[PDB]
Amino acid sequence: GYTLWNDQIVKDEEVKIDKEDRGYQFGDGVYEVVKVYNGEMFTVNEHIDRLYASAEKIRITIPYTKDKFHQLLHELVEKNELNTGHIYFQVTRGTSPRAHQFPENTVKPVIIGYTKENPRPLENLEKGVKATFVEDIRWLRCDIKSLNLLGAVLAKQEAHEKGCYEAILHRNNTVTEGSSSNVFGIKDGILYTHPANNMIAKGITRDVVIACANEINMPVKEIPFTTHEALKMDELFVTSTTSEITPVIEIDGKLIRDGKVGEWTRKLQKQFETKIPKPL
Amino acid sequence: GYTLWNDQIVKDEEVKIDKEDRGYQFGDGVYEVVKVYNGEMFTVNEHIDRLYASAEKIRITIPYTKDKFHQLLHELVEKNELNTGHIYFQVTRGTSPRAHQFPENTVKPVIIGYTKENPRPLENLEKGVKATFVEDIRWLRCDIKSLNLLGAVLAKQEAHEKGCYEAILHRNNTVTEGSSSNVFGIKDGILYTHPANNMIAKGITRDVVIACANEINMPVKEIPFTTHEALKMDELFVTSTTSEITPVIEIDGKLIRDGKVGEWTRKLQKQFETKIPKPLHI
Numbered sequence: 001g002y003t004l005w006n007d008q009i010v011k012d013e014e015v016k017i018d019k020e021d022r023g024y025q026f027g028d029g030v031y032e033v034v035k036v037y038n039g040e041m042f043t044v045n046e047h048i049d050r051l052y053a054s055a056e057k058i059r060i061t062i063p064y065t066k067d068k069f070h071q072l073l074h075e076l077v078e079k080n081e082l083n084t085g086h087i088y089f090q091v092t093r094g095t096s097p098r099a100h101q102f103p104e105n106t107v108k109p110v111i112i113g114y115t116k117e118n119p120r121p122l123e124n125l126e127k128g129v130k131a132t133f134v135e136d137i138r139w140l141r142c143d144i145k146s147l148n149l150l151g152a153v154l155a156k157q158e159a160h161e162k163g164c165y166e167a168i169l170h171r172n173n174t175v176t177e178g179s180s181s182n183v184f185g186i187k188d189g190i191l192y193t194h195p196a197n198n199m200i201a202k203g204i205t206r207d208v209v210i211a212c213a214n215e216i217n218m219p220v221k222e223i224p225f226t227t228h229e230a231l232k233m234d235e236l237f238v239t240s241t242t243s244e245i246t247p248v249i250e251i252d253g254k255l256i257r258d259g260k261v262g263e264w265t266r267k268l269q270k271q272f273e274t275k276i277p278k279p280l
Numbered sequence: 281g282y283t284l285w286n287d288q289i290v291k292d293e294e295v296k297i298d299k300e301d302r303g304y305q306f307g308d309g310v311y312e313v314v315k316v317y318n319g320e321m322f323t324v325n326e327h328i329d330r331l332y333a334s335a336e337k338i339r340i341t342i343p344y345t346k347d348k349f350h351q352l353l354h355e356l357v358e359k360n361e362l363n364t365g366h367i368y369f370q371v372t373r374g375t376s377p378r379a380h381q382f383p384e385n386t387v388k389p390v391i392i393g394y395t396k397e398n399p400r401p402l403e404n405l406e407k408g409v410k411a412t413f414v415e416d417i418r419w420l421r422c423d424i425k426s427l428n429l430l431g432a433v434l435a436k437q438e439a440h441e442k443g444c445y446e447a448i449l450h451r452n453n454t455v456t457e458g459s460s461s462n463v464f465g466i467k468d469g470i471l472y473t474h475p476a477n478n479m480i481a482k483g484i485t486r487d488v489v490i491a492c493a494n495e496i497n498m499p500v501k502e503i504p505f506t507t508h509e510a511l512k513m514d515e516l517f518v519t520s521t522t523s524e525i526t527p528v529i530e531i532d533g534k535l536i537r538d539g540k541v542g543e544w545t546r547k548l549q550k551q552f553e554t555k556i557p558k559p560l561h562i
């Protein structure tokens with residue numbers, strides 16, 4: 001395939017990462033994942049807006065404007081002939097002799113982007129998934145979508161080992177988000193989810209789901225709930241660019257309600273489905 | 281120069297890092313820094329013991345033994361002809377298609393190691409430095425020396441912008457460590473430092489400085505102290521492989537006592553000196 005390396009689209013084999021790339025020694029960079037449906041990028045502007053905001057938060061100045069960045073992504077999709085799957089892209093502060101503080105503002109940021117054909121998790125959207133509770137030991141700036149992902153890596157593996165699909169994290173019993181998704185709970189036709197502060201990533205899927213709820217007149221309350229309250233919910237699901245709206249029917253051996261996909265989750269899924277590209 | 285790449289010492293230009301190296305995508309790896317004095321490696325075994333402990337804490341299996349790793353560093357020092365400086369080395373989980381969970385146990389960890397010529401911090405060791413307090417917002421497993429260093433990066437930059445050498449971190453007003461060092465405080469002839477738990481990295485120089493304290497009969501108490509207590513200390517200093525024992529004489533424009541290096545710091549520095557690699561007559 002072809003990889004985006006800065007502003008060029010090169011063959012995979014051509015890309016070489018420097019051992020002193022700050023993204024390799026300090027996890028000093030930010031990333032995004034954009035889902036593609038039948039050749040079309042879903043909510044691409046929102047993801048690009050978020051990439052730039054993340055970079056701005058740790059003071060990385062991206063050398064291209066948003067219009068150029070958008071253009072490159074389109075070229076990347078086209079050259080690789082991507083139908084349905086996702087684009088992964090990241091930006092690191094640059095290559096410089098190892099030192100914690102920022103380099104001289106002459107160093108250029110390194111941009112890597114590549115695609116992967118990957119089908120929609122249809123089986124999961126229908127049947128639902130298993131999850132587990134993992135304590136959130138991450139840093140206090142979860143709002144930045146950075147490359148420092150060791151906390152999420154350790155959580156995802158704890159779940160993967162128990163045969164669970166996702167690890168729902170919690171700070172002292174208060175549910176925050178999942179290792180790579182946002183968590184939603186429904187009780188009496190009302191949608192609950194942790195507010196978007198420094199404790200969680202302000203997911204783009206999460207915001208699309210909240211817009212879907214507003215469109216079907218379902219009340220939304222951005223209030224955090226405990227692990228205990230979560231098990232008492234009528235319905236529960238996690239959201240992410242790749243997981244879309246995945247129902248969580250069971251957590252740690254305790255079924256959520258009856259262990260079936262609730263009524264409102266289906267309504268959200270149907271509304272969400274009206275937004276994804278489906279050209280002929 | 282030459283770079284250690286897995287189990288081989290090769291020329292820099294031959295090293296090729298893959299975009300899906302987990303160290304590049306998730307900061308999934310651990311690291312060590314070893315100081316070299318006039319060709320001799322300082323406390324190398326402790327550092328290697330710590331690299332293996334860190335890797336083990338995140339379930340990475342270093343493919344070869346400690347003796348092989350040591351032999352390799354020695355080679356690396358020899359090939360690069362390093363006099364005084366340090367060896368930086370890191371291990372990541374490996375290259376695998378992007379996914380958060382561990383790959384199959386058939387993926388081999390990536391080992392990268394290289395040297396840098398760097399003199400002892402003479403002026404700092406003698407004159408002392410200024411520091412600044414920064415809120416510790418890092419993750420809760422700071423005992424693991426991993427590649428997730430963005431908090432330390434934002435912290436050191438903050439110190440650097442205010443013209444300071446190091447950022448003294450504090451969690452809930454309690455002093456933990458510096459962005460790349462340990463912090464010690466001296467009061468009425470007693471040595472204080474945060475205990476070695478999940479809140480700080482158990483530094484090698486830290487352990488060496490405590491060993492030095494026992495040797496000069498200086499009492500040591502591993503109890504945490506707050507920002508307020510730190511500013512009322514008689515003496516204060518930071519420790520690290522590259523900083524050794526660097527006196528902190530000021531924090532945010534507040535002199536520690538009178539702004540001069542203290543007697544116990546000086547004594548600790550002299551005792552530390554006897555541990556550094558040196559000949560016998562040269």
Ligand SMILES: *Cc1c(COP(=O)(O)O)cnc(C)c1O
Pocket residue numbers: 033145152177178179180181182201202203204205206239240241242
């Ligand atoms: C990526 C990610 C999400 C998912 O957000 P989307 O923007 O909807 O893909 C949620 N939480 C965390 C911690 C993430 O890293």
Ligand SMILES: *Cc1c(COP(=O)(O)O)cnc(C)c1O
Pocket residue numbers: 313425432457458459460461462481482483484485486519520521522
């Ligand atoms: C490396 C590191 C130290 C340094 O300890 P050494 O004495 O060099 O072993 C201290 N604190 C942090 C946060 C570090 O990452």
